[model samples]
Target: DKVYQMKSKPRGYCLIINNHNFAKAREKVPKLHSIRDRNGTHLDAGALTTTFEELHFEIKPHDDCTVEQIYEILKIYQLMDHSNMDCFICCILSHGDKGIIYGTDGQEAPIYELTSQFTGLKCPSLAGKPKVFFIQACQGDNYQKGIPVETDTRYIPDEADFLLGMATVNNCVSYRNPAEGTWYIQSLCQSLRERCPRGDDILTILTEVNYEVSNKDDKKNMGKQMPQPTFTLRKKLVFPS
Candidate 1:
């Protein structure tokens, strides 16, 4: 019989990059600079939901935190070092698209490239370890009456190891309430706090977040709706581990 060796590492750590105040950049776009459209983005809801986790930070947005600012912070915290023996997470709650996230100056940074800094190649300390990123932003400007029901079913491929959580699906308007803020974050945190401790997996927790948002909220308000999570976990991950 062949024996395998597991990393035997304790639960991984998390860093919630809650980019809200925009580091005073809100002073510029004073108009609207949200990573999410309406489906999600106010992370306080998620913060209230997840509990007993290893690491989580709410990195608010700032004008000084432009592309260069992000690099500086990631380096200062060793998040991009990649040689440390720890799992990491970097959530960007700011304006975004398929490949870009907003900086304080309203400039965009490539999601892949920015995140690439932490990969095994760029940041060796993080090789083979998980580097999860949750993005709350707009992918495109398109909406519909309803998501067309499916008839014939086709199997979707297995998920990847570098997940990219998005607020709304592509080309659709996401909804939200000015009072409560983002729906996805609220539901996500709610589910994590409620279910993560019972040994539920990350994907499982995300599923519940979707269900709760879809079921409990009102869809009549003329705002964007439908938040989502995309991930790339190498294997099943239970919270606190």
Candidate 2:
């Protein structure tokens, strides 16, 4: 059977890009002055840390990183050798709208800018391993009204084995509780924690996260957020305890 083994000495690096404060972004970009700080994001970071640690990942956290720093941190990870690891995860919690995510410095970067760094052609160490990314930022101001139904490129074209888990679909905003944490992120951590021990593959765990997050809605507004997972994994990724 095909399976991305998680039996390596360490599963892999779980990089948490926790960006909560936007003061630097506001200071540099006047238009972003309206961007308020993420009051409850700290809880998301904490939960992510504990969950990944339990799964035997090496935790690497960077809080309040600027746009340059964000890219730089990813660059650091991209060059690391992952030949001995089973998987890699990078979680980004920041301010965003549409297809772009803003760093603490108020600068906007396309989501592709970060994901492109791990291509199989470039980072061969992680080529065949699962590279999972969780972006916990609003994609836009739109909300999902509940729909249904259905629905990429080169050879080993460097895109294989990558998974992009977005907080919400394109052009939609995700929900975050001021007293708690983001609906997408908190729900994800919960699913992973409960599902991993049961030997569920990562995709099934993510589906559970999608269910939990979608069931909840904005209390102050008539809207719903849907967590989306786009991946190219060719095998099952079940972290055994």
Whole-model lDDT per candidate: 0.54, 0.88
Q: Any runs in candidate 2 off by more than 4 Å, and if so which?
A: 146-155
Q: Scored by Cα lDDT, where does model 1 land? A: 0.54
> Best candidate per lDDT, number?
2
- What is the overall TM-score of model 1 with all chains considered together? 0.68
User: What is the C-alpha lDDT profile of model 2 across 1-241, one tens digit per residue?
Assistant: 6888789768999999988889887788988878899989999999999999999999999999988999999999999988889889999999898888999988998998889989898788998889999999989877777655454043565799989999999988888787989999889889889989998998899898887887787756668898899988888878887
* Candidate 1 backbone clash number: 40
Across 129-200, the per-residue lDDT of candidate 1 in tens digits comes to 566666665665554244444554433222234555666776554444556755666566667677755867
Per-model TM-score versus the true fold: 0.68, 0.93
Which ten-residue region of model 1 has the weakest summed lDDT?
A: 1-10
Best by TM-score: 2
For all candidates, the clash counts are: 40, 3
